[PDB]
Design an enzyme around this catalytic site. Structure first.
Site, short mmCIF file in Angstrom:
data_model
loop_
_atom_site.label_atom_id
_atom_site.label_comp_id
_atom_site.label_asym_id
_atom_site.label_seq_id
_atom_site.Cartn_x
_atom_site.Cartn_y
_atom_site.Cartn_z
N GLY A 157 0.80 -1.21 0.00
CA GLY A 157 0.00 0.00 0.00
C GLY A 157 0.84 1.26 0.00
O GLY A 157 0.45 2.27 -0.59
N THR B 39 -0.66 -2.82 13.36
CA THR B 39 0.30 -2.11 12.52
C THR B 39 1.70 -2.70 12.65
O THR B 39 2.11 -3.15 13.72
CB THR B 39 0.38 -0.61 12.90
OG1 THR B 39 0.60 -0.48 14.31
CG2 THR B 39 -0.89 0.12 12.51
N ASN C 132 -7.31 4.82 11.19
CA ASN C 132 -7.92 3.62 11.76
C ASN C 132 -8.30 3.83 13.22
O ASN C 132 -9.29 3.25 13.71
CB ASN C 132 -6.97 2.42 11.62
CG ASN C 132 -7.22 1.61 10.37
OD1 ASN C 132 -8.26 1.76 9.71
ND2 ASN C 132 -6.27 0.73 10.02
N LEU D 202 -13.98 14.83 -11.08
CA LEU D 202 -12.85 14.82 -10.14
C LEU D 202 -12.19 16.18 -10.02
O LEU D 202 -11.67 16.53 -8.96
CB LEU D 202 -11.81 13.79 -10.58
CG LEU D 202 -12.28 12.35 -10.58
CD1 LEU D 202 -11.14 11.45 -11.03
CD2 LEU D 202 -12.75 11.99 -9.19
N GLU E 74 -13.64 19.02 -9.84
CA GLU E 74 -14.34 19.89 -8.90
C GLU E 74 -13.88 19.65 -7.47
O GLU E 74 -13.86 20.57 -6.66
CB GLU E 74 -15.86 19.71 -8.98
CG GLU E 74 -16.44 20.16 -10.29
CD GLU E 74 -17.93 20.47 -10.24
OE1 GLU E 74 -18.55 20.44 -11.32
OE2 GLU E 74 -18.49 20.75 -9.14
#
Ligand SMILES: Nc1nc2c(ncn2[C@@H]2O[C@H](COP(=O)(O)OP(=O)(O)OP(=O)(O)O)[C@@H](O)[C@H]2O)c(=O)[nH]1
Ligand SMILES: [Ca+2]
Ligand SMILES: [Mg+2]
Ligand SMILES: [Mg+2]
Lengths: 51, 439
Positions: free
Chosen positions: B146, B179, B206, B252, B254
């Site tokens: 990620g 984590t 989270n 997108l 805007e």
């Protein structure tokens, strides 16, 4: 690619270190062989000389 | 109509992406086999929901979505899940071995191997688009994939799609929700690398989701499913304007126009209400004034921080359900006289308001009760910089001893990239202070 090459340099250093370990392993066992054989040769020669 | 492609990277992005598309299908009346009885143009159309779904001749509505994880176990629960039939194989992309919580491994070592494939599969979706707007990218800050692969992909998306907008939904790490100890490193590394490639980023902490799940759903130890179904509700609130008729945030661009005056300060705070337990039998329905007031309660924010000790640049109110403008302005007038709401001097003190009459959809059997009205506030406030300061502080503690750094250098990353990254975040923190504080 520069990061890939840095990984490759580090692996190559590693394999080169391990190669030095393998040659030390070789030197140790040929040293043991050499000393057992020199014991046998010494003993054989002293025996022959004293007889 | 202009199309949007969603991209889900790593475990958090994929599992959250699962929850959102489940929700999108419910909101639009699309069955798990992809059929949509409401849609009377078979195999085509340019309705608003076609921004997120294409159509096959068979009448199947297919997400404009790609799922990418450097390990196969999470995406395999999409392949074999409840919506198997929705996606086709080309959209699910798994590598062999993951990034081991390591940004450098996700970015340099494995990312190199898999980026061209991912870009090729995205190209197959872009080719079906008559007018692609850009991308919505779902990912954790903290994971090795990620963080590390997302940043490589965002760089390459700016190359291959230079004119396209890119929005992020980013999961900010919190020790309450398992984590890695190196997540501060990964977070800073990927923010630095992604900063100039993202046009607007919604951080979700989270810790905030976890606490809302404990406090308002009275779930003692919330699961990923609990967390992700709440997150998907907020995501759906944010993306509704792209998928339904309306005039606010309809493309997108805007989002940037309405929420981001300064390109680097592009992290709006999201605040959502109400969140009501479904096992709570009889609950009073909250009014427009109450749910709007709850938008200024830190306990309802996606990132915990104190907006009173900052300044607003922009504010959008996104309502779903039984809401009329009259009630919004009444509630706003009241709130202006009781809350501490400071805008920067170079910006209008005001609110852009969007209302969709359809009340929120919830997942049958989930932990969230149906409500007759809800609101998501999106505000660009400097107070969110508290989240950066917290993360930056943890990074400093570990980096001062070079703890764990060798894992990153061993993947081909130079130690200097830590300092580069951290210095960028230092500028970022000072940009926020300049904008929102006075001496
Ligand atoms: N909200 C939410 N957070 C998640 C979920 N899965 C993982 N996380 C969080 O994401 C961060 C860990 O990164 P992941 O996305 O799991 O890891 P990854 O991207 O798959 O990368 P690697 O496994 O290291 O290759 C941690 O902060 C987790 O708490 C999820 O389904 N929902
Ligand atoms: Ca149609
Ligand atoms: Mg993973
Ligand atoms: Mg089009």
């Amino acid at each position: 690619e520069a990061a890939e090459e840095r990984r490759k340099y580090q692996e190559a250093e590693l394999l080169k270190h391990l190669a030095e370990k393998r040659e030390h392993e070789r030197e140790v066992i040929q040293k043991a062989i050499e000393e057992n054989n020199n014991f046998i040769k010494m003993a054989k020669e002293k025996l022959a000389q004293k007889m | 109509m202009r199309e949007c492609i969603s991209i889900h990277v790593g475990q958090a992005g994929v599992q959250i992406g699962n929850a959102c598309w489940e929700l999108y299908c419910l909101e639009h009346g699309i069955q798990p086999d992809g059929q949509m009885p409401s849609d009377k143009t078979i195999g085509g159309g340019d309705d608003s929901f076609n921004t997120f779904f294409s159509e096959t001749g068979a009448g199947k509505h297919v997400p404009r979505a790609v799922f990418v994880d450097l390990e196969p176990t999470v995406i395999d629960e999409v392949r074999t899940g409840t919506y198997r039939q929705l996606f086709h194989p080309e959209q699910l992309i798994t590598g062999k071995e993951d990034a081991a919580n390591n940004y450098a491994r996700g970015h340099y070592t494995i990312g190199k191997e898999i980026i061209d494939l991912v870009l090729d599969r995205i190209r197959k979706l872009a080719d079906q688009c008559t007018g692609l707007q850009g991308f919505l990218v779902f990912h954790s800050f903290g994971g090795g994939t990620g963080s590390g692969f997302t940043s490589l992909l965002m760089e390459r998306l700016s190359v291959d799609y230079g004119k396209k907008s890119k929005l992020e939904f980013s999961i900010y790490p919190a020790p309450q929700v398992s984590t890695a100890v190196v997540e501060p490193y990964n977070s800073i590394l990927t923010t630095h690398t992604t900063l100039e490639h993202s046009d607007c980023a919604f951080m979700v902490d989270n810790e905030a989701i976890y606490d809302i799940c404990r406090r308002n759903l009275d779930i003692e130890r919330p699961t990923y499913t609990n967390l992700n179904r709440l997150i998907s509700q907020i995501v759906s609130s944010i993306t509704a304007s792209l998928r339904f008729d309306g005039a606010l945030n309809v493309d997108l661009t805007e989002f940037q126009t309405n929420l981001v005056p300064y390109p680097r300060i592009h992290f709006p705070l999201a605040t959502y209400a109400p969140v009501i337990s479904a096992e709570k039998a009889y609950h009073e329905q909250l009014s427009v004034a109450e749910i709007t007031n709850a938008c200024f309660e830190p306990a309802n924010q996606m990132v915990k921080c104190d907006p009173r000790h900052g300044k607003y640049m922009a504010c959008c109110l996104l309502y779903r359900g039984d809401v009329v403008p009259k009630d919004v302005n009444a509630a706003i007038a009241t709130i202006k006289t009781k809350r501490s709401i400071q805008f920067v001097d170079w910006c209008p003190t005001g609110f852009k308001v969007g209302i969709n009459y359809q009340p929120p959809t919830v997942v049958p059997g989930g932990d969230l009760a149906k409500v007759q009205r809800a609101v998501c506030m999106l505000s660009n406030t400097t107070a969110i910089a508290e989240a950066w300061a917290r993360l930056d502080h943890k990074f400093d503690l570990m980096y001062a001893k070079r703890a764990f750094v060798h894992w990153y250098v061993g993947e081909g990353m130079e130690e200097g990239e830590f300092s580069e990254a951290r210095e960028d975040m230092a500028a970022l923190e000072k940009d926020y202070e300049e904008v929102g504080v006075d001496s």
